[PDB]
Symmetry: C3
Subunit: 417 residues, 3 copies
């Protein structure tokens, strides 16, 4: 007889497949994601780059008559008339020497450049670094790469480019980390007679721990370290991965570097800051990339400093960056003990040829290492991929192919006639 039951079942089988495909395909277009977390003790962890700056930008003994003439006003050492202000806070022979230095009678100005000034007058790592050790191995001034920041001449440990085939840490604790003893040299601090962006009321250093493929932004993001203490910095590397649209909203540039090889929030901000200053001040500050001419002291005071301050303080629209797809964050827990103890003050004073009082106001020890659970990952993952879609329809699709197959083994003869 006539069995419509077969044509009805075939339709159903196709109908069920249509619904499953529509449902699963709709969910797929929602491009959902899941964030996977894990916190473990990784081995062979790559030690980061560590940048540090003295809070004092220019060494008093390195400031010359010509430097004073050109940048004196910027440093608040001279008034708008090339003269020492009514601010004479130096009952010492520091004012005396400064007045001789400020004597411009018959003085002939010589060429001046801010970058050269920072490079020449900035604190010298060779003098600041009293000792340096990384995982039991002694490091020297040469292990530090010079990098210019808003603080001027700063230094980066393990910047990555030398030999030492990637520095790594294996265990938790100070032993597997970096330990440095520094002399901040307050005797070389520039007298502070006013408040300016280059002026500092504080003594110590600013530090920033960051990935080697990310430039520092130490004036904004660094942490402080005070003289007279041994500071312990226990860290945890946190690797965050994000997804680009339609899943997420991150971004990731390719090899080609407008200024920086890798994309990061800092690289983006510095890039944007530089273009903003070049456009508005027709010059770049000494710590900025590119080839525009460096700003003169006058431009720093009249345009550059106020322009950058606007960007890092008030701006809400000019330099806003998009999330990178790859970010490395370093969680840190800081603590400190006093240096020197009464029992070691004499030993340190003699060793470095300083008074005991000096040691207590200038020496600092900094330990940067990782805790046992040194590695955490937070990665956005695609929740419903193709393999997941096909798998979700494969089951129902099979039953349909089967019905069609059984339809073939049922009409093979009739069809063949």
């Amino acid at each position: 007889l006539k069995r419509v039951v077969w044509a009805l079942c075939f339709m159903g089988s196709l109908a069920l497949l249509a619904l499953v495909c529509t449902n699963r395909i709709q969910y797929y277009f929602l491009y959902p994601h899941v964030t996977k977390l894990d916190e473990v003790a990784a081995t062979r962890l790559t030690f980061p780059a560590v940048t540090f700056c003295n809070l004092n930008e220019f060494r008093f003994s390195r400031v010359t008559k010509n430097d004073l003439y050109h940048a004196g006003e910027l440093l608040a050492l001279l008034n708008n008339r090339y003269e020492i202000p009514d601010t004479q806070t130096a009952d010492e022979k520091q004012l005396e020497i400064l007045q001789d230095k400020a004597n411009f009678r018959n003085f002939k100005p010589k060429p001046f450049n801010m970058l050269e000034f920072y490079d020449r007058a900035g604190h010298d790592i060779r003098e600041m670094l009293l000792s340096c050790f990384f995982r039991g191995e002694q490091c020297s001034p040469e292990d530090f790469k010079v990098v210019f920041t808003r603080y001027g001449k700063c230094y980066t440990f393990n910047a990555g480019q030398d030999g030492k085939p990637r520095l790594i840490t294996m265990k938790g604790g100070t032993g597997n980390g970096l330990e440095i003893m520094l002399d901040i040299q307050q005797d070389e601090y520039l007298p502070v007679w006013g408040e300016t962006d280059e002026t500092s009321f504080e003594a110590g250093i600013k530090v920033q721990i960051h990935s080697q493929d990310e430039p520092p932004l130490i004036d904004q993001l660094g942490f402080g370290v005070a003289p007279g203490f041994q500071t312990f910095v226990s860290c945890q590397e946190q690797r965050l991965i994000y997804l680009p649209p339609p899943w997420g909203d991150c971004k990731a540039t390719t090899g080609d570097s407008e200024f920086y090889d890798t994309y990061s929030i800092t690289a983006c901000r510095i890039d944007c800051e530089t273009r903003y200053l070049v456009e508005n001040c027709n010059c770049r500050m000494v710590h900025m990339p590119g080839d525009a001419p460096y700003c003169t002291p006058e431009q720093y005071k009249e345009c550059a400093d106020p322009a950058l301050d606007f960007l890092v303080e008030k701006d809400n629209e000019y330099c806003v960056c998009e999330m990178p797809c790859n970010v490395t964050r370093y969680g840190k827990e800081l603590s400190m003990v006093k240096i020197p103890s009464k029992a070691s003050a004499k030993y340190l004073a003699k060793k470095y040829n300083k008074s005991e009082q000096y040691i207590g106001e200038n020496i600092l020890v900094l330990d940067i290492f990782f805790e046992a659970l040194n590695y955490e990952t937070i990665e956005q993952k695609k929740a419903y991929e193709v393999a997941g879609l096909l798998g979700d329809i494969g089951g129902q699709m099979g039953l349909f192919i089967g019905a069609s197959i059984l339809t073939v083994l049922e009409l093979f003869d009739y069809a063949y006639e």
Copy 2:
């Protein structure tokens, strides 16, 4: 060749048992009301800057303590053993004992009305005197940007309380520039001499600070962090928004549970509310920093009932004042660091600017920077892992597999069974 009949018969049966087991196991799972906690850490824009409350560790300014104050609160502050003997304890500042011995002479003195709130409000440190400089995102702030708030430390101040005005302060980029920077003078010259150990006296110098959501009251004596004079302290933060699910899936309490003294539910609001009811019931008074309208405890009540009662609650209590988890919580992760102030090179400038000795600057001035790091926003939210719609979808998919498999049977066992 009859086996080809039982095969499609067993398959159908099996396909039936599978539909049953899977569906039953998924409805049971549903009734376990499971949850998933979703985590995401990003760099948010237009982040709302939190409220920042701070208190001087010294509760009463020496120069503002009068004869009447000493008469009423001298015992509480450990400055007097009784009202008939003259103080004789040497003070760091020699002139303080002399002034104290004169203020302590009550012979022929007529006591005037006294109030602890009035005393705190009048003798507590003045923000207009402590605040040397204040800047938020490049803009200069002033004492008026600070709202007076009473805590267990007495008269304290909150920056960006969000009580008055309207202009919501926002942060956009990571770093000190997008944050708050304040320079304070803690005024140790105004610190009351410490001659005994009480809950109102302190061995320390500096301030206590608490960064909190604007809709959450502070609990600074318990949860604040310290900031020391002689340093510039950097506080790099990260906002963490946590969302919890109610009783079925979780065990939180809607931040709208019959608002008592506060309109938003938080652990702190709950603790303060509970503490207040405890004190009003057991002491018949409330401390100056507590809400409500109960009478304010007198100095006598502070010493005899209030301090002991509040200490019991924040230290020993395990049952009286316990709070349920709120469904909405905002935590601020913080990383602190510091550098020294002043440098030898700036000490003279600061001394001259504020007419103080260089030594004074070194023991009283501090600078505090509160800002956010690049990845300023983290979210940790509990979500229902299996809702009804999800259960239906799964059941619908299972039936789809059932019908699909059974069709092969009806089609191969048609001629036979029918």
Copy 3:
């Protein structure tokens, strides 16, 4: 033969089903995991153990002529000739007493033991502890357990297994925690005339907050606390649970307790370090477990310190520890204020019978407590278990079987072709 359009149906049929099953089965064999996170305010949270050490290892007043003879060089107080270098080095007050104590004229060395020296000369909790309060209740020296570490004689508050009820925290804040005031006693600090693993340029204490079943490794993992400040340590307990193979690479506390009842990274490191030193120096440092003989001060300087330093600084393969399946981490946020204020110095000086100057250079207060959200859990869970696999492809691998039988039962009757 047009029989292929019949042989393909069975093969194609078993193809799809096989594909659908292999998909989830291959996934199952990857043994995927999911990490569940939660952060809450737990009630009756178990307070951790808190270990602390003075940065100075030996009290000047407790050093004897015989201690000086045996440990002098190790402490840099004597040169390799048993003599005190150029007098112009330290306080003449201490120099004199030290010169007298160093006078070895026809002196006969008596037996010496480093453990005994640390125990006798190390700082005494009875002297360092000025006050101690836990949740409003006074604690005392008897509340601290002695524990030897590389810093020498240290102390642990709430070590546990002390026959007392478990200490618990219920609310956030300083009130529900520990507060201790210590005197670091710089007047007892050994003069420093050189740099050795046993000398310190710093003054203060080292502290380590840890679970009671985990030994301390304070020289490597502790945090510092400075004199002249009240330090606040706001904590959050974080419980991490990991899965063993094939899901993960963690190892649980199985077998016997070679040295410790529970497994932890620190227990593993201390065990390994001990074995390493016994092998290379045939002795163990005072803070190590076991029964090997204690290294002499000469062995410390010539073999032990260099050996341990190698392990904690340079080694990359000798002591590699596996991940525990259970870990408790304590996140912490530190802050501080100054002590004493100008207004409280006299009171403290009088109360503890010390000069005002002494108070400012030796006293410190430490507060260890938990924030409101005191408990975080991060646990690895199995993502795809057998029941889940069967729930996904139970029907497919079921039909595949039937199709297979139906197939074997097919080409079988096909064997009929043999006749012809």
